[PDB]
Design a protein around this ligand. Structure first.
Ligand SMILES: Cc1cc2nc3c(=O)[nH]c(=O)nc-3n(C[C@H](O)[C@H](O)[C@H](O)COP(=O)(O)OP(=O)(O)OC[C@H]3O[C@@H](n4cnc5c(N)ncnc54)[C@H](O)[C@@H]3O)c2cc1C
Ligand code: NA
Ligand code: NA
Length: 423
């Protein structure tokens, strides 16, 4: 349905663009170019060095059902070889609790998980399809808490929240269920609860660096795109060092930001302007009284505690002078954004409360994170519209907004974009 000779420009060398290149290439499309703005590849899979080891500034983990990432590893020769994840739960005062052994709440949560599992198996069949082009059940378009409440499954949120809100994906009072359950589908949720999780000694970034290297055309880096225009059935890309024509455009970069350097048509401007995102802040810390295990703080995942540390990552157990990363959110639709400065102070105060006082913050990053749309915009058919635009003036839309903000979902989506439109 697209000719193998086509000149394909892929924008972004994160997992989504690297995966697009991989699957295009494996389908016989040999004339692609990946254009990356930064010096590096892997995007939010970002694994810097410190004292001879890599720590994670972005993505850390996967699950055994990450079949597309397995396919990437098969190609690169990478293996799941990182340290085992373990965790404890803390209250906002730093006291350790065991929600699994709460004899009142515990059964109520697991009862609701049971009930939800059966709904997902029957009534909501299809919910877990990659992407949103297969229109989900209307109930899944509601905020996750409303969806649960409609089904009498509210207590399930106690399980689902920990790998969601603390992972920067926002809050169940407003995030549509369709996103929550495509990421944490039942089998995935069960893997998280069991601790059956993948990590990489050399960082999530490594396998993407290795993927890039296996490509017939590794990414061009430090490419500053000033304008894209799409006349006469072609794509013209202007950069600070060259300007070139392509036949096809694949976008794995933020679509609202794309409006600012493109000849965005009426629909693009209208719809991509509706995209909202998360401000997810990570601090790479050196600490005293080194933790012995990672910690989750459900109390700090409430919208009323916005900006507090929700989780910290104990990566290298053997070395107390290694990096502990902390995670917090700076935005919520119903509260004013928290400033970088007040959040940083909460890093210091919370880690102190938890008994792991910060000696040094060596790196901090607020990521552009989990692009999505509101329940109202989802219900109003945002994905029917945008997916209906696929191919218009030879432009295809992919990346996080089109699926979910995790590395397996975006790579899966890229794989399928090829099947759907190209082959
Ligand atoms: C702190 C943190 C924790 C996370 N935890 C996990 C996890 O445990 N499991 C999981 O599966 N995922 C996790 N993620 C999410 C995961 O990293 C992302 O979903 C994944 O990297 C998305 O890939 P992508 O290619 O769509 O986007 P990105 O990774 O954001 O990559 C986009 C690329 O496009 C480039 N780009 C942007 N604009 C332009 C432009 N103007 N021109 C050219 N290039 C451009 C960027 O530089 C980047 O290389 C985590 C992320 C973070 C930050
Ligand atoms: Na860099
Ligand atoms: Na549990």
């Amino acid at each position: 349905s697209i000719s193998k000779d086509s000149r394909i420009a892929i924008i972004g060398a994160g997992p989504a663009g690297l995966a697009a290149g991989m699957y295009l290439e494996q389908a016989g499309f040999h004339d692609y170019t990946i254009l990356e703005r930064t010096d590096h590849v892997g995007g939010k899979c970002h694994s810097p060095n410190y004292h001879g080891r890599r720590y994670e500034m972005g993505a850390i983990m996967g699950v055994p059902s990450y079949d597309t990432i397995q396919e990437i590893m098969d190609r690169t020769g990478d293996k799941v070889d990182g340290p085992k994840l373990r965790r404890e739960f803390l209250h906002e005062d730093g006291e350790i609790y065991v929600p699994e052994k709460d004899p009142v709440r515990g059964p109520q949560v697991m009862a609701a998980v049971q009930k939800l599992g059966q709904l997902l198996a029957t009534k909501y069949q299809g919910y877990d399809a990659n992407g949103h082009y297969n229109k989900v059940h209307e109930d899944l378009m509601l905020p996750f808490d409303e969806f649960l409440a409609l089904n009498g499954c509210e207590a399930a949120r106690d399980l689902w929240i920990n790998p969601f809100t603390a992972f920067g994906y926002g809050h169940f009072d407003n995030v549509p269920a369709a996103y929550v359950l495509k990421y944490l589908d039942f089998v995935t949720m069960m893997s998280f609860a069991k601790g059956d999780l993948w990590t990489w000694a050399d960082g999530t970034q490594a396998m993407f660096e290795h993927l890039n290297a296996t490509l017939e055309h590794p990414a061009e880096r430090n490419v500053d795109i000033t304008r894209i225009t799409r006349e006469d059935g072609k794509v013209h890309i202007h950069t600070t060092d060259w300007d070139r024509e392509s036949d096809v455009l694949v976008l794995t970069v933020p679509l609202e930001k794309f409006l600012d350097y493109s000849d965005a048509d009426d629909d693009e401007r209208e719809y991509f302007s509706k995209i909202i995102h998360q401000q997810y802040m990570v601090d790479a810390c050196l600490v005293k009284e080194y933790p012995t295990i990672s910690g989750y703080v459900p109390d700090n995942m409430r919208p009323e505690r916005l900006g507090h540390v929700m989780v910290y990552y104990h990566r290298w157990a053997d070395d107390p002078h290694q990096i502990i990363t902390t995670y917090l959110l700076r935005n919520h639709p119903d509260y004013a954004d928290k400033t970088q400065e007040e959040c940083r102070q909460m890093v210091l105060d919370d880690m102190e409360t938890f008994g792991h006082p910060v000696e040094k913050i060596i790196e901090e990053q607020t990521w552009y994170y989990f692009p999505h749309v509101s329940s109202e915009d989802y219900k109003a058919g945002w994905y029917e519209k945008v997916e209906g635009m696929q191919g218009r003036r030879n432009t295809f839309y992919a990346g996080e907004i089109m699926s979910f903000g995790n590395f397996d979902e975006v790579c899966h989506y890229s794989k399928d974009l090829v099947t759907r439109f190209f082959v």
